[PDB]
Amino acid sequence: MATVLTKGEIVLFALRKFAIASNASLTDVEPQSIEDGVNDLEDMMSEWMINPGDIGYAFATGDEQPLPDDESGLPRKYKHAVGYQLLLRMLSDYSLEPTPQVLSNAQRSYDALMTDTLVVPSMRRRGDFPVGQGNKYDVFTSDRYYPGDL
Amino acid sequence: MAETLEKKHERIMLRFDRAYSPQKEVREKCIEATRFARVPGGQWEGATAAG
Numbered sequence: 001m002a003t004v005l006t007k008g009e010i011v012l013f014a015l016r017k018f019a020i021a022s023n024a025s026l027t028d029v030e031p032q033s034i035e036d037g038v039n040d041l042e043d044m045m046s047e048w049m050i051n052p053g054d055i056g057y058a059f060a061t062g063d064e065q066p067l068p069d070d071e072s073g074l075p076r077k078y079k080h081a082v083g084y085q086l087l088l089r090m091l092s093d094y095s096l097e098p099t100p101q102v103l104s105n106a107q108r109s110y111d112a113l114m115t116d117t118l119v120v121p122s123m124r125r126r127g128d129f130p131v132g133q134g135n136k137y138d139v140f141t142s143d144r145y146y147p148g149d150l
Numbered sequence: 151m152a153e154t155l156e157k158k159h160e161r162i163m164l165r166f167d168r169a170y171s172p173q174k175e176v177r178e179k180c181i182e183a184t185r186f187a188r189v190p191g192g193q194w195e196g197a198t199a200a201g
Contacts, residue, residue: 127197127200127201128197128200138175138178138179138182139175143196144196145196145197145200148200
C-alpha cells in the first residue's frame with residue numbers, strides 16, 4: 001500500500017495520542033515500552049481472529065520475536081481503529097484513565113472498521129420446499145424441490 | 151437389404167428415435183400424474199431422502 005505500516009508505527013501512534021512519548025508535548029521515549037507495546041499488539045491481533053474476524057494481519061512465522069520494524073500487512077484504512085483499541089488496552093500500564101473524547105473517537109473508529117466487514121448471511125430455501133410447475137422442473141431444469149444444501 | 155440383411159434395422163431404429171423425441175416431455179407428465187395419484191409414497195417423490 002501507500003507507505004506500508006510497520007508494527008512500530010502503530011505503537012508509536014498510540015503512545016503519542018495520549019501524550020506519553022512525543023515531540024509535541026514535552027520530550028522522550030523508552031525502549032521497554034516498545035517491546036511491551038508490540039507484544040500487546042500481537043496478542044490483540046491473535047484475539048481478533050474470533051470476534052471482529054481476520055483483517056489481514058501478518059503474524060510472525062515460526063517463533064522468533066515480532067520486532068517493531070516488521071511489516072504489519074494492514075491497509076492504511078485501519079490504523080486509527082487498531083491504534084485506539086491498543087491504546088485502550090495499554091493505558092493501565094502507566095496508571096491512567098481515558099477521557100470521554102478518547103472513548104468517543106475509539107468507538108467511532110471501531111464502528112468504521114465494523115462497517116467494512118459485514119456479511120448478512122442471507123438464509124436459503126429448505127430442501128423439502130417444492131418448486132412450482134411454473135418453472136418447468138421436467139425439461140428446462142431438473143430436481144423439483146430445492147436442493148437447499150450444497 | 152431386408153430380413154437377414156439388417157439394412158432395414160437401421161431404418162427401424164432411426165424411426166424409433168424420430169418418434170420418441172417430440173413426445174418426450176409430454177409423457178413424463180402423464181407418468182408423474184399417475185404415480186402421484188396411485189403409488190403410496192408418490193406425492194413426495196423428488197425429495198424422499200432430505201434432511
